[PDB]
Design a protein around this ligand. Sequence first.
Ligand code: MYS
Ligand code: CL
Ligand code: CL
Ligand code: NA
Ligand code: NA
Ligand code: NA
Ligand code: SR
Length: 296
Amino acid sequence: MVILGVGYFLLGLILLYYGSDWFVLGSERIARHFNVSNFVIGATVMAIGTSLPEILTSAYASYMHAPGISIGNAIGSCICNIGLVLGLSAIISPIIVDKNLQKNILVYLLFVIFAAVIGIDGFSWIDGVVLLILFIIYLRWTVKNGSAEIENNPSVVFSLVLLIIGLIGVLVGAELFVDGAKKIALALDISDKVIGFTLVAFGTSLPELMVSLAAAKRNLGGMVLGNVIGSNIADIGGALAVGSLFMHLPAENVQMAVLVIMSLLLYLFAKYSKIGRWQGILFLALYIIAIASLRM
Ligand SMILES: CCCCCCCCCCCCCCC
Ligand SMILES: [Cl-]
Ligand SMILES: [Cl-]
Ligand code: NA
Ligand code: NA
Ligand code: NA
Ligand SMILES: [Sr+2]
């Protein structure tokens, strides 16, 4: 079963690599079909589609009476998306944010701060209902300001096929990757549960990572930023929220503070500067410091 672990691992990588490119390409075409910006398609369809692991993991964990894992998943993924995911992408393809998208990032920051404040004492099921609703409002507000009201085609059909098959590719690939790695570690008897549930946020962050990198290579910085901003909101208003429904989630004040600081930096760079190499390097530096000092 060490061989079936290597098999899953490698093929999971292959599915993640090509699958992410198809998802990116299919999303880019869809955005042009619905006359919406790449940021919008990244903030909605791509963000939610790639946060399906987080939502399912947080829901399942809290249902299995592990609310620590549930919120850990969620917040940990947000920190990962800014520090690691956006950090790598910014360096690859620097982003100059237009004033319109700056408003969106400011709203994001407000949402994050609000989540941190109401979460000081933990997250009740009521907290989850509120966040989930703001999640919904955010999506509709984002789509409205990023769409243009104007107008069964083989260009449209091929676009949806690319996106859906691509999405299946990154979700399955990320699962095979995690499966394969864990069954390699079990056959080698180097299995570690504490390390395992430390990487829970990363395994679920695999789709965001590969998808953003794919978009970064094609200079789709708006799509990248949309995917990051939307995934975080999807992780909080979706994964965290659903987790709180099954069970009260314990306070993660240190992690929330880290996320707030990163989110604040993200807004400030977007408004007064750019999200380029040195902003990207800083994000990675902070992320590395984070995974070196935060409790496992
Ligand atoms: C396409 C040209 C890319 C040049 C990339 C330079 C990247 C420097 C990354 C430094 C990361 C530091 C992380 C903390 C040690
Ligand atoms: Cl727990
Ligand atoms: Cl773009
Ligand atoms: Na996501
Ligand atoms: Na994810
Ligand atoms: Na994640
Ligand atoms: Sr609370």
